[PDB]
Amino acid sequence: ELTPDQQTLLHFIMDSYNKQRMPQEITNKILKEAFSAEENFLILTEMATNHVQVLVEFTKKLPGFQTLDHEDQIALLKGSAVEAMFLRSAEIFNKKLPSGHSDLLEARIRNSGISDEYITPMFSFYKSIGELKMTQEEYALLTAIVILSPDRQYIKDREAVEKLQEPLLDVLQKLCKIHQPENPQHFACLLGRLTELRTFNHHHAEMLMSWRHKFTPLLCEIWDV
């Protein structure tokens, strides 16, 4: 059971996580736009760009994040952007769309000029995560934990990041005991998906160097393209 300060932290996180969702114009573009590599690619670029905005807004509200050294703030954002994008994309793919829109988004992703080297681990990861049957609290906390990863490159004050991450891990741990007492290794299973997640750093770097369609200036900045 959650201590009342753990409850206050969860509630604060969830309010920030629920605050920004997927705009209707993009969602309708999934259903209604022409299907072609260039057009499919553009939709996805537009989803990724909206995600970056949402990610920065959520990150800025994480307890303690604004007290960190300004260079550390940037390193955490840059270091977590891809992983957090994949985590949100899994949530959207499994939970936040009608059955129709998921099938069509999958099709669009599979025909957007992306290599098969990258597609296969992607859908494998989405099916893996989908089989965990995560709640929205679990997605919110895992997103926060991935952002506040103290082992990113060029983080000066790693201990300071550990302190911000640890309370979120403790809460996530209690939610895995509560919502699945059936499975006492469920917490570790979740943290296993973080390992899968980290592989998308290599895959995403590869897909990026293997270009040149234009990205947005925000995407180029946060991906270092």
Binding site: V56, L77, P217, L218, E221, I222
Partner: peptide
């Protein structure tokens, strides 16, 4: 090249 992310982080 901080410009966009920095703007997004610092803005109110």
């Amino acid at each position: 090249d901080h410009q966009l992310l920095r703007y997004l982080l610092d803005k109110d």
